[PDB]
A paper describes a structure:
Here, we report the discovery of a series of macrolides called sequanamycins with outstanding in vitro and in vivo activity against Mycobacterium tuberculosis (Mtb). Sequanamycins are bacterial ribosome inhibitors that interact with the ribosome in a similar manner to classic macrolides like erythromycin and clarithromycin, but with binding characteristics that allow them to overcome the inherent macrolide resistance of Mtb. Members of the sequanamycin family bind in the same pocket of the ribosome as erythromycin. Like other macrolides, the sequanamycins bind in a narrow part of the peptide exit tunnel at a site that lies between the peptidyl transferase center and a constriction in the tunnel that occludes the lumen, near ribosomal proteins L4 and L22.
Numbering used by the authors:
A (entry chain L2A): 2 to 273
B (entry chain L34A): 1 to 48
The structure:
Amino acid sequence: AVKKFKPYTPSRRFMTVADFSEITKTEPEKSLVKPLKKTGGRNNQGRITVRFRGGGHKRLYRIIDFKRWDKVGIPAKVAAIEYDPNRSARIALLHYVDGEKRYIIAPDGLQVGQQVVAGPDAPIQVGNALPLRFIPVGTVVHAVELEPKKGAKLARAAGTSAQIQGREGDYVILRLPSGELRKVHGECYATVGAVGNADHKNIVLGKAGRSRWLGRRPHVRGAAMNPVDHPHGGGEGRAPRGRPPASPWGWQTKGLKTRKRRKPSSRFIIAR
Amino acid sequence: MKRTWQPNRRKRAKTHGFRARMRTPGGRKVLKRRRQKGRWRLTPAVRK
RNA sequence: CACCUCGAUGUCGGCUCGUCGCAUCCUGGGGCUGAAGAAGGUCCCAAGGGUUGGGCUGUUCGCCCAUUAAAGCGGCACGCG
RNA sequence: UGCGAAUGCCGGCAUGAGUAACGAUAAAGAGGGUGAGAAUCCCUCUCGCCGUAAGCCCAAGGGUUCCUACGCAAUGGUCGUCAGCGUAGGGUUAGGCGGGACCUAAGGUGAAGCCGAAAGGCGUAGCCGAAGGGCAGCCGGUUAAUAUUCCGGCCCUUCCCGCAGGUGCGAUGGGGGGACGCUCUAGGCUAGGGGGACCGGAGCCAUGGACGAGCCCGGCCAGAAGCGCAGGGUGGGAGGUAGGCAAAUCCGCCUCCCAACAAGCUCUGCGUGGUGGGGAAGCCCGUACGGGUGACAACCCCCCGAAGCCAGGGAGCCAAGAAAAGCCUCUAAGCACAACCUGCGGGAACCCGUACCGCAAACCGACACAGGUGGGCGGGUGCAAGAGCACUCAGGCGCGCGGGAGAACCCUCGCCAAGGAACUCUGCAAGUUGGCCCCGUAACUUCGGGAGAAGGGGUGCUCCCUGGGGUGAUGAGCCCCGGGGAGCCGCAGUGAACAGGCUCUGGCGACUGUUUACCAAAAACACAGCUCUCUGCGAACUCGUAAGAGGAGGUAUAGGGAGCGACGCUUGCCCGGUGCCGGAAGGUCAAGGGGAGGGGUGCAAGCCCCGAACCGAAGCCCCGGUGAACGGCGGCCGUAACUAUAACGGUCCUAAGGUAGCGAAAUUCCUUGUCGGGUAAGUUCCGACCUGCACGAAAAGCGUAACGACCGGAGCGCUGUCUCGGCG
RNA sequence: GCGAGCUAGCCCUGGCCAGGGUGAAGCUGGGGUGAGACCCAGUGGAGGCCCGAACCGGUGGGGGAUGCAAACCCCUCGGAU
RNA sequence: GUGGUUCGUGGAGCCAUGGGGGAAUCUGGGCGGACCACCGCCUAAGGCUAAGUACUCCGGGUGACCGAUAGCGCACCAGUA
RNA sequence: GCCCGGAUAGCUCAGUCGGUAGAGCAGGGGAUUGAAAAUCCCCGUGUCCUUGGUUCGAUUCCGAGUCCGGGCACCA
RNA sequence: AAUGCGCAGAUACCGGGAGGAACGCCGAUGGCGAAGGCAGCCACCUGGUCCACCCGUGACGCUGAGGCGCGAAAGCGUGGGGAG
Ligand SMILES: [K+]
Ligand SMILES: [K+]
Ligand SMILES: [K+]
Ligand SMILES: [K+]
Ligand SMILES: [K+]
Ligand SMILES: [K+]
Ligand SMILES: [K+]
Ligand SMILES: [K+]
Ligand SMILES: [K+]
Ligand SMILES: [K+]
Ligand SMILES: [K+]
Ligand SMILES: [K+]
Ligand SMILES: [K+]
Ligand SMILES: [K+]
Ligand SMILES: [K+]
Ligand SMILES: [K+]
Ligand SMILES: [K+]
Ligand SMILES: [K+]
Ligand SMILES: [K+]
Ligand SMILES: [K+]
Ligand SMILES: [K+]
Ligand SMILES: [K+]
Ligand SMILES: [K+]
Ligand SMILES: [K+]
Ligand SMILES: [K+]
Ligand SMILES: [K+]
Ligand SMILES: [K+]
Ligand SMILES: [K+]
Ligand SMILES: [K+]
Ligand SMILES: [K+]
Ligand SMILES: [K+]
Ligand SMILES: [K+]
Ligand SMILES: [K+]
Ligand SMILES: [K+]
Ligand SMILES: [K+]
Ligand SMILES: [K+]
Ligand SMILES: [K+]
Ligand SMILES: [K+]
Ligand SMILES: [K+]
Ligand SMILES: [K+]
Ligand SMILES: [K+]
Ligand SMILES: [K+]
Ligand SMILES: [Mg+2]
Ligand SMILES: [Mg+2]
Ligand SMILES: [Mg+2]
Ligand SMILES: [Mg+2]
Ligand SMILES: [Mg+2]
Ligand SMILES: [Mg+2]
Ligand SMILES: [Mg+2]
Ligand SMILES: [Mg+2]
Ligand SMILES: [Mg+2]
Ligand SMILES: [Mg+2]
Ligand SMILES: [Mg+2]
Ligand SMILES: [Mg+2]
Ligand SMILES: [Mg+2]
Ligand SMILES: [Mg+2]
Ligand SMILES: [Mg+2]
Ligand SMILES: [Mg+2]
Ligand SMILES: [Mg+2]
Ligand SMILES: [Mg+2]
Ligand SMILES: [Mg+2]
Ligand SMILES: [Mg+2]
Ligand SMILES: [Mg+2]
Ligand SMILES: [Mg+2]
Ligand SMILES: [Mg+2]
Ligand SMILES: [Mg+2]
Ligand SMILES: [Mg+2]
Ligand SMILES: [Mg+2]
Ligand SMILES: [Mg+2]
Ligand SMILES: [Mg+2]
Ligand SMILES: [Mg+2]
Ligand SMILES: [Mg+2]
Ligand SMILES: [Mg+2]
Ligand SMILES: [Mg+2]
Ligand SMILES: [Mg+2]
Ligand SMILES: [Mg+2]
Ligand SMILES: [Mg+2]
Ligand SMILES: [Mg+2]
Ligand SMILES: [Mg+2]
Ligand SMILES: [Mg+2]
Ligand SMILES: [Mg+2]
Ligand SMILES: [Mg+2]
Ligand SMILES: [Mg+2]
Ligand SMILES: [Mg+2]
Ligand SMILES: [Mg+2]
Ligand SMILES: [Mg+2]
Ligand SMILES: [Mg+2]
Ligand SMILES: [Mg+2]
Ligand SMILES: [Mg+2]
Ligand SMILES: [Mg+2]
Ligand SMILES: [Mg+2]
Ligand SMILES: [Mg+2]
Ligand SMILES: [Mg+2]
Ligand SMILES: [Mg+2]
Ligand SMILES: [Mg+2]
Ligand SMILES: [Mg+2]
Ligand SMILES: [Mg+2]
Ligand SMILES: [Mg+2]
Ligand SMILES: [Mg+2]
Ligand SMILES: [Mg+2]
Ligand SMILES: [Mg+2]
Ligand SMILES: [Mg+2]
Ligand SMILES: [Mg+2]
Ligand SMILES: [Mg+2]
Ligand SMILES: [Mg+2]
Ligand SMILES: [Mg+2]
Ligand SMILES: [Mg+2]
Ligand SMILES: [Mg+2]
Ligand SMILES: [Mg+2]
Ligand SMILES: [Mg+2]
Ligand SMILES: [Mg+2]
Ligand SMILES: [Mg+2]
Ligand SMILES: [Mg+2]
Ligand SMILES: [Mg+2]
Ligand SMILES: [Mg+2]
Ligand SMILES: [Mg+2]
Ligand SMILES: [Mg+2]
Ligand SMILES: [Mg+2]
Ligand SMILES: [Mg+2]
Ligand SMILES: [Mg+2]
Ligand SMILES: [Mg+2]
Ligand SMILES: [Mg+2]
Ligand SMILES: [Mg+2]
Ligand SMILES: [Mg+2]
Ligand SMILES: [Mg+2]
Ligand SMILES: [Mg+2]
Ligand SMILES: [Mg+2]
Ligand SMILES: [Mg+2]
Ligand SMILES: [Mg+2]
Ligand SMILES: [Mg+2]
Ligand SMILES: [Mg+2]
Ligand SMILES: [Mg+2]
Ligand SMILES: [Mg+2]
Ligand SMILES: [Mg+2]
Ligand SMILES: [Mg+2]
Ligand SMILES: [Mg+2]
Ligand SMILES: [Mg+2]
Ligand SMILES: [Mg+2]
Ligand SMILES: [Mg+2]
Ligand SMILES: [Mg+2]
Ligand SMILES: [Mg+2]
Ligand SMILES: [Mg+2]
Ligand SMILES: [Mg+2]
Ligand SMILES: [Mg+2]
Ligand SMILES: [Mg+2]
Ligand SMILES: [Mg+2]
Ligand SMILES: [Mg+2]
Ligand SMILES: [Mg+2]
Ligand SMILES: [Mg+2]
Ligand SMILES: [Mg+2]
Ligand SMILES: [Mg+2]
Ligand SMILES: [Mg+2]
Ligand SMILES: [Mg+2]
Ligand SMILES: [Mg+2]
Ligand SMILES: [Mg+2]
Ligand SMILES: [Mg+2]
Ligand SMILES: [Mg+2]
Ligand SMILES: [Mg+2]
Ligand SMILES: [Mg+2]
Ligand SMILES: [Mg+2]
Ligand SMILES: [Mg+2]
Ligand SMILES: [Mg+2]
Ligand SMILES: [Mg+2]
Ligand SMILES: [Mg+2]
Ligand SMILES: [Mg+2]
Ligand SMILES: [Mg+2]
Ligand SMILES: [Mg+2]
Ligand SMILES: [Mg+2]
Ligand SMILES: [Mg+2]
Ligand SMILES: [Mg+2]
Ligand SMILES: [Mg+2]
Ligand SMILES: [Mg+2]
Ligand SMILES: [Mg+2]
Ligand SMILES: [Mg+2]
């Protein structure tokens, strides 16, 4: 489901907004929000280090739980599903039985009411977090730790999902949303299922303004500049690239690979 | 039109003020030079 | 060609204003004619005055339309910012 | 150590010259006064201008410009007796207004800690930091000049110390709260405004009429408790308890109960309200201006009504909307002859600002500069509405040179016989059209548009009839939206002012946007969207020597880089060269390893030099791949039963020889190509043809509704652009 | 070494946008059907929607050119949730 | 791998030292310009040490130094207006 | 107007160290066929563009000329 | 035959793994459906049809322009997938 509009204005022809049906709560859990400093892409020198960033709606950080073992075997009821302006996915507010409320990244399928729990115990059911080694092969799973106790860092974007392909000693074989096959330690936790809000990828921004609301300032092609600014700058009219296509900093940008070859993690990767 | 001097009494002392100079080594040298030359005022005249 | 001007002599056309030349487009005078008349042809005298309005192109020019006695050619820093 | 030159330097004085100017075309005239001196100062009258301002109040800036008295050398674009100028004197009063003895924001700083040749850079806590949060004063009078500051009336807040009554009290710690978007919006009020036949008031009867429910002026403001009338906030109990980094009886969670669109508690707003003030015109006062009287002033009724208040109100939406303290609660140590809470009394309540200008002669612009400067108020009538326009109240102003005159010429403006784009690069400019209501409206279209398309008709006033609302009561009054019929006047009824000219047809760009501050606003940039590529997270990338930071408190539906640029239909062949990608072999290759063998000296033992194989990375070579990677995408001769042409053949070269579609095009040199169309006449324009000097598919190709202060062509309407000028 | 008191971007916190038009979704009702899609009304009040002041601009033209002005003035024009 | 020295890789020692390796205590070590041999000179990897040397904000004494456009930017209430 | 390249069998073209020049197609003669093609066997003509010159000797080397092709004609 | 693959270790053979599509034998000239069509196996939801019985209704029938629904392959849109 995704909302379309009649063309009562241009750019409304193609505009497309998400379907907010699975949303249950509007204002968030007051005890679970922090303010987030908006950078505008500037570092701690006052300099831009990521271009074309800034403006866009004020946002409130929802402090969310990517380590699920700190409540082993305590279960919780799924209280709400709410909009989170800080990720593509939607978050689920869950009430633990001991009274703690936490934000979880809400898997596909999960809806208000069901029990959820983390731990080596845990039935294999959407929402439950478990160490990988006890998650049966061929289970789709998200919010995956990359190293034990360092927090979930894998598959957390809307409709993403990893899948367990096999086991090797302390490690297990994962296929990531990027199709790469990597070994991950068995002790790494993972809530089972896929992320959901899976239609994120079909919203059609529609107009320039909509890009601004997400804090994306306009983005100017090197071809449009002068040689002082860009490797593609200058010429007379238009001009093709005239050289291997490059970034403002002059490195090749079609095919040229950048992963550090000597990286220690090379030992645990096997795909593309 | 809108000219280049837009006075602001906070700005002035925040920018060229005595305590402003004294933090940067460059600015302590401004005072050093201004005294050695014998300026009547090392820092711009301001009014809180 | 490179003589004045590079401590600067604003460069095309149009508009306004003209003025001069005559190697005369018209009008005036004439010779010859393969000049019957009428209309021409070509050469001579003659610079007083006249020498249209529009389409196209920045155009000068040129080509068209409609007329005309005729729709002259040149020069004046390719006259005149 | 000798000056005539250096567009030499400093200074002085000429020329232009009694010349241009005297700074908005809002505008002046007269009378009286003053003074040596008056167009220019004071005063009266008349006239004009602003009035969503050119009036009034905040804030920033400025810093005595404020008030008074005495001055006029200079400053004042003239004059000056005047001044924002000279001299002197005076003037700014706060527990409640602003800010500090309160809070935190970005950011700064910064114990701990990390980094850096030095200087220094980073940095969790903490601290600093405000037009945000918190917090108790309204109204009149008074001064030459301050006033929510003094005075008066009424009312509050905090600290300290006492009583009295309560209660396990008690933090910098736990929890609640503070606390939050945009658009639309209900009800009830308040500000503000209009009317009144009613209440009050000096007075007036003019010039033809009018002694009338005549004209003119005014009919309020602040206000504790208690009371109403609106609204907002909030469930009440008992058990369990592993969470809120100790403890909580508090919060969270669970289970019971009662309560439930309320109530009851609170809390704000509004009204009333003790009391306290104000209180016009006009007239007389001598003020530059205030006073007296009007007066024992009256102080009421109705209507309109916020955008403001009740306010954390309600609905919808997606882009998802600060923090911290005060405040409440909870418990920890500690203490409970403490402490806190609740009332009531007495005491105590500091620092700084406070004048004046403040859309401008006091600020920013070298100037008393036609420029620039944020928030609030901003009345009345009419115009459909309105902060629009015309007039006008309160208020403020006539712009610090004047007097004449009545040429050319210039600027700004009005009109123009006949013609109507003939003007010119171009309808440049100006005209025309202009509001509201109603009738009506094509191609095409992405079905929304195109549309205000086009094109018309109506519009004033008078009398009669008459339907709804809102408020009152269902009734009158007062408003609001109207509907029907008769008639009046003019050239003309949106009678002034504000207020689209319209159509057809191409190019380009999809679109709203953006840009060369100050000669370019565009077909340029951006843009949603498409593709390629990188990147597994201590990500890639960027800044930094580093620490560190951004990326991102994100995680492949994510992030970086590149090109293309809605959408529709599509995007062909070439990997030889270059780039990127993949190749655990081979060749080459640096340090290093390794030392066959040579050498210098020594009597030697030695010491010390070179040094061949061979082992040696990345890179290059080599082998592959790769086109939304850099890029490329042919020639000549022949041939069909009329000619012409060539579907067909021959052959050279290449990595391969340009597919669809478009084509004298923003590309066509020859060129004003040739043909058709428009015109009387068309180097432009539109349609075609193909010989494409020198189109062609993401430096995209061909189209496309809608959009455009873009650029081209045509026409209608209308005009001083023109014939061709004239008058003012 | 001094500069973001002009200007460009971003960050924090506040403020502003008269008045008119148009009339998306969603409701609700009616039709429709086996059930729907859908159709019609009324309500509703969306939009880098329309007209137009403030406000932000700077299209064409005229003036100005030792200017009122080292970028101004007048008419006109664009945007204006 | 570099710096210093007249020494720019040169036959390149000496002094210093970022990296690696890594001793000896007099029969020990360093040096006399690659190296070896002889012959000599010194005693590293700890430290202190007046004077003779440099400068002129300041005080004095002198001038084939200036004399108000000179002389310090300033003879004067100048690092001021 | 200024430079570079080419011209060889009837067509499209290789080539040369200075001496005897070839390829493919076309064409000719034979074969196969009922008869044409396609196929098989056999066959070059070349004054290597003109002209001058170097040579013993020149298609070959040189200098000009005709012709063609390509690139150029910029600030102005 | 050649392109192609192969000492950079191929084919052929063993073991591990990933992935997609189609379901041998049964299988038939057989079955079902209105047609297009339907094939491994398991479960759920569901349509038609046949028979037995002679119980119920009582002509409620047949056909069917328009309308509505289904409709092999290829093809088109948005996403996914991609072994042959
Ligand atoms: K771009
Ligand atoms: K360019
Ligand atoms: K010259
Ligand atoms: K003549
Ligand atoms: K000129
Ligand atoms: K001189
Ligand atoms: K003079
Ligand atoms: K004076
Ligand atoms: K002046
Ligand atoms: K504050
Ligand atoms: K507390
Ligand atoms: K009250
Ligand atoms: K005051
Ligand atoms: K006015
Ligand atoms: K005169
Ligand atoms: K003409
Ligand atoms: K009534
Ligand atoms: K209009
Ligand atoms: K296009
Ligand atoms: K524009
Ligand atoms: K641009
Ligand atoms: K972050
Ligand atoms: K290639
Ligand atoms: K290749
Ligand atoms: K290649
Ligand atoms: K060696
Ligand atoms: K053509
Ligand atoms: K072309
Ligand atoms: K014709
Ligand atoms: K014609
Ligand atoms: K435009
Ligand atoms: K609206
Ligand atoms: K040396
Ligand atoms: K040594
Ligand atoms: K020595
Ligand atoms: K020695
Ligand atoms: K010493
Ligand atoms: K002097
Ligand atoms: K001096
Ligand atoms: K060849
Ligand atoms: K041959
Ligand atoms: K494939
Ligand atoms: Mg909080
Ligand atoms: Mg450019
Ligand atoms: Mg730059
Ligand atoms: Mg470059
Ligand atoms: Mg380039
Ligand atoms: Mg350029
Ligand atoms: Mg180009
Ligand atoms: Mg990748
Ligand atoms: Mg200045
Ligand atoms: Mg002093
Ligand atoms: Mg000369
Ligand atoms: Mg001269
Ligand atoms: Mg003559
Ligand atoms: Mg003449
Ligand atoms: Mg003449
Ligand atoms: Mg023309
Ligand atoms: Mg003519
Ligand atoms: Mg000439
Ligand atoms: Mg000449
Ligand atoms: Mg000329
Ligand atoms: Mg002189
Ligand atoms: Mg002097
Ligand atoms: Mg003097
Ligand atoms: Mg003169
Ligand atoms: Mg004169
Ligand atoms: Mg004059
Ligand atoms: Mg004046
Ligand atoms: Mg007088
Ligand atoms: Mg007077
Ligand atoms: Mg004023
Ligand atoms: Mg000042
Ligand atoms: Mg005064
Ligand atoms: Mg006086
Ligand atoms: Mg004077
Ligand atoms: Mg005054
Ligand atoms: Mg004074
Ligand atoms: Mg104190
Ligand atoms: Mg710091
Ligand atoms: Mg603080
Ligand atoms: Mg405040
Ligand atoms: Mg007062
Ligand atoms: Mg005052
Ligand atoms: Mg007062
Ligand atoms: Mg307590
Ligand atoms: Mg009131
Ligand atoms: Mg009232
Ligand atoms: Mg009113
Ligand atoms: Mg009386
Ligand atoms: Mg009378
Ligand atoms: Mg009476
Ligand atoms: Mg009476
Ligand atoms: Mg009142
Ligand atoms: Mg409860
Ligand atoms: Mg506890
Ligand atoms: Mg209530
Ligand atoms: Mg009250
Ligand atoms: Mg009295
Ligand atoms: Mg609300
Ligand atoms: Mg604090
Ligand atoms: Mg009290
Ligand atoms: Mg004041
Ligand atoms: Mg003033
Ligand atoms: Mg004033
Ligand atoms: Mg004032
Ligand atoms: Mg104002
Ligand atoms: Mg003033
Ligand atoms: Mg004023
Ligand atoms: Mg000024
Ligand atoms: Mg003035
Ligand atoms: Mg001014
Ligand atoms: Mg007003
Ligand atoms: Mg009105
Ligand atoms: Mg109106
Ligand atoms: Mg007005
Ligand atoms: Mg007045
Ligand atoms: Mg004015
Ligand atoms: Mg006329
Ligand atoms: Mg007329
Ligand atoms: Mg006409
Ligand atoms: Mg014309
Ligand atoms: Mg015009
Ligand atoms: Mg007009
Ligand atoms: Mg049509
Ligand atoms: Mg329509
Ligand atoms: Mg329509
Ligand atoms: Mg009338
Ligand atoms: Mg109008
Ligand atoms: Mg064209
Ligand atoms: Mg555009
Ligand atoms: Mg628009
Ligand atoms: Mg510009
Ligand atoms: Mg601008
Ligand atoms: Mg301009
Ligand atoms: Mg412009
Ligand atoms: Mg980080
Ligand atoms: Mg582009
Ligand atoms: Mg060795
Ligand atoms: Mg290698
Ligand atoms: Mg290769
Ligand atoms: Mg392509
Ligand atoms: Mg192109
Ligand atoms: Mg391309
Ligand atoms: Mg394009
Ligand atoms: Mg096109
Ligand atoms: Mg089009
Ligand atoms: Mg635009
Ligand atoms: Mg005229
Ligand atoms: Mg005149
Ligand atoms: Mg700034
Ligand atoms: Mg700034
Ligand atoms: Mg708009
Ligand atoms: Mg508008
Ligand atoms: Mg408009
Ligand atoms: Mg306003
Ligand atoms: Mg502005
Ligand atoms: Mg302009
Ligand atoms: Mg406007
Ligand atoms: Mg050296
Ligand atoms: Mg050397
Ligand atoms: Mg020696
Ligand atoms: Mg002397
Ligand atoms: Mg001097
Ligand atoms: Mg002096
Ligand atoms: Mg030939
Ligand atoms: Mg010869
Ligand atoms: Mg069945
Ligand atoms: Mg029977
Ligand atoms: Mg089908
Ligand atoms: Mg298919
Ligand atoms: Mg296709
Ligand atoms: Mg498909
Ligand atoms: Mg696909």
